[PDB]
Design a protein around this ligand. Sequence first.
Ligand SMILES: NC(=O)C1=CN([C@@H]2O[C@H](COP(=O)(O)OP(=O)(O)OC[C@H]3O[C@@H](n4cnc5c(N)ncnc54)[C@H](O)[C@@H]3O)[C@@H](O)[C@H]2O)C=CC1
Ligand SMILES: NC(=O)C1=CN([C@@H]2O[C@H](COP(=O)(O)OP(=O)(O)OC[C@H]3O[C@@H](n4cnc5c(N)ncnc54)[C@H](O)[C@@H]3O)[C@@H](O)[C@H]2O)C=CC1
Ligand SMILES: O=CNC1CCCCC1
Ligand SMILES: O=CNC1CCCCC1
Ligand SMILES: [Zn+2]
Ligand SMILES: [Zn+2]
Ligand SMILES: [Zn+2]
Ligand SMILES: [Zn+2]
Lengths: 376, 373
Amino acid sequence: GTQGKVIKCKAAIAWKTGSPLCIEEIEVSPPKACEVRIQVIATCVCPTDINATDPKKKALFPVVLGHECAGIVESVGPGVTNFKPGDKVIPFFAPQCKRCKLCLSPLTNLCGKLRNFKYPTIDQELMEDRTSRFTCKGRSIYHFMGVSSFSQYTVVSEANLARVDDEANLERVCLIGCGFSSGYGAAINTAKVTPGSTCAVFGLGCVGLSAIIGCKIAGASRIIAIDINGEKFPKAKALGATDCLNPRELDKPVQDVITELTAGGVDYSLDCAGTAQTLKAAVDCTVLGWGSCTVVGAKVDEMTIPTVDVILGRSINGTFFGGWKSVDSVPNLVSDYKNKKFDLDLLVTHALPFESINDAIDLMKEGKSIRTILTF
Amino acid sequence: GKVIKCKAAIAWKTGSPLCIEEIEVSPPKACEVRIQVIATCVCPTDINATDPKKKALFPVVLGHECAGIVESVGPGVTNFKPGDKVIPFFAPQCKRCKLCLSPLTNLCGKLRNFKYPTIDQELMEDRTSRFTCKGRSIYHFMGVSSFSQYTVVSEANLARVDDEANLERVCLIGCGFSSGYGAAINTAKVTPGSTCAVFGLGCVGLSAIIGCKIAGASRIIAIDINGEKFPKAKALGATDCLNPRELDKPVQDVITELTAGGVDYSLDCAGTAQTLKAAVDCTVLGWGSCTVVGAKVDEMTIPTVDVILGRSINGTFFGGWKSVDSVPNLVSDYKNKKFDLDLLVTHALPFESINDAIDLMKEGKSIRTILTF
Ligand SMILES: NC(=O)C1=CN([C@@H]2O[C@H](COP(=O)(O)OP(=O)(O)OC[C@H]3O[C@@H](n4cnc5c(N)ncnc54)[C@H](O)[C@@H]3O)[C@@H](O)[C@H]2O)C=CC1
Ligand SMILES: NC(=O)C1=CN([C@@H]2O[C@H](COP(=O)(O)OP(=O)(O)OC[C@H]3O[C@@H](n4cnc5c(N)ncnc54)[C@H](O)[C@@H]3O)[C@@H](O)[C@H]2O)C=CC1
Ligand SMILES: O=CNC1CCCCC1
Ligand SMILES: O=CNC1CCCCC1
Ligand SMILES: [Zn+2]
Ligand SMILES: [Zn+2]
Ligand SMILES: [Zn+2]
Ligand SMILES: [Zn+2]
């Protein structure tokens, strides 16, 4: 684990699609220029990781999945000075090189670092110099979304991580790595929820729940939580939801129930589920004139919206990592948590050994968990 | 309260052109004004009403883009008097509802059908018509019905304008110009130094180009499959012109390459499945904004990834202008030469030759044909 030397450690590898992850012993090369090798302390399983193991979806194999985590810097490549061994950090799929047009713009959190703009899931599958830091059984392993946290040690670009509070609880702040930040920021930054406004959140998993926390912090007077899984309602309400609706138990489309309940629709809707149903419902349930729909989750490649709807005032946009300038914002979210601005503990339903990663996956696929904290 | 006998164009049924008929225009009741139409244009929306594939009501007095003068006002009306120059419009501002009070929209509670606005405001406020022809009551069209020497509109559908206004040009403010102009300024919210793309170069797209220029855009790309529309687009500010028919690559890729990433704002003033798709594709990632103005199809398919990567989509209704309050100002701006509406008028024809104005429009030979009496 010493600097400059290759590290051998446990990691979950997906040798191919539609298969369960395999606990292997891999070789993690040392960081090259502008890279940082991190000791992953805690990591969660995000549906996007599972999505990668879906035969119906495009992906690269073999690969070290995982991208939501927190850890400690083990070593930094040549020329790196903003990071040093011992620092607590949180990597993320959304880079912020701070040295490009996109990074300079206050209108986006995208970065010129990103290359693929049609399949973000298969981008950042290798380091800058198009090579991998991972090796297992003489084979080269693909990185995932610039993070690959399903390994006790991973190497990431400097543009893909932030140093956080020295006293940050790595087993909770790891949620800031993707899930929490994405939903929280979708409400605050992308949808731009305003005080006294009404909101609708579709999908009550970690993202949807964080979106609710965000709407609450933003001052929404009413937050309608929608999910086909009634179990998700208690946690939703505990986080600020004022109304809960299960499309499965309604005789009318859920968007028409929301419209009636609010006498015209909500000011802001956030789809944190992403199905054909939710995407359409998320747009329909907003008020005409100024209704705003924000796409957060997306299980489908397209959404179809009537021309008359946009003409009559409905707007549609979407988020990428909650609209946060990652490097600058992540440290702030960690501080907000330290100051108890929101409670990340309510997002953790399970905590298993890394070896039990496949069980963490099943729990999620089965919708029996929000987030499962995996530790090595 | 005299009943006026005049000529007007009536659409008796779908699939048939308008007919010049002698009609009886009843006097204005409460909160109403009887206008003497001085100049009116045919808008593609007027033409669509007679298209079998489109929802519409019959019989009907079509038209909604015009300018005229007050012939007589209804009981209690004080904001209008005979002789005042006025401009009616489909976007009402009754100033008696919740929507009118809201600074986040220019919609109005007077509107009732939000799925088919073209068949809305088909009758006055008291659900009765002011038009009669051969013992038959005729529907009004979008609260205006300008294809008549005289028409009656709700007070919420008109505004008094500058006494020295050239009704022969300011009539464009009744719909086409206001919508395109406002789409750029109010809806897309074009910013100084920005790059824009305008699809469809008819009266709306051209006005959108004018809007983009006034808003300070530094680059305005004009796209149309009809190259004959470019000269005027350039005359109004277009910096680049692209004809999809003459490009081997999809026009959106050409726009993206020509701008190294796309434009900041796109405005679709054509409305086909292709332009709507191109309008979104050609915007930059991160903050690209597509504003739907024209719409020939009921739906638009947006890739989920586009929105996630920063592109946004919205639409305009009468250019987002609070009609009653804004219309008078647009007239003043023209008076002050803030922009020149004369360029939008390509032809002039006697009202009775309305069907010829319609044919010109369908041949793509015109922007706006003024119909006079
Ligand atoms: N845009 C961005 O930057 C990000 C997007 N995401 C995406 O957001 C989504 C949500 O993430 P998680 O909360 O972690 O996932 P999750 O699987 O825990 O959440 C899905 C929830 O939506 C519900 N649902 C499914 N179909 C539904 C329907 N028809 N109507 C209502 N509810 C329905 C489920 O019952 C479940 O509670 C995922 O699709 C994920 O890939 C995650 C991070 C960032
Ligand atoms: N949202 C709102 O409140 C309003 C919407 N409109 C609508 O806006 C649209 C435009 O109105 P006008 O300028 O008066 O109509 P128009 O018929 O004169 O304009 C259409 C123009 O687009 C071009 N075009 C057609 N297919 C094209 C393609 N694939 N690519 C590029 N250009 C293409 C045509 O050659 C033509 O020059 C109409 O659909 C109209 O109903 C008009 C007023 C207000
Ligand atoms: O879950 C993490 N990341 C993904 C979510 C879908 C859009 C791109 C980023
Ligand atoms: O062209 C004039 N008006 C259009 C405005 C958008 C709705 C259909 C009517
Ligand atoms: Zn994720
Ligand atoms: Zn950057
Ligand atoms: Zn019109
Ligand atoms: Zn009103």
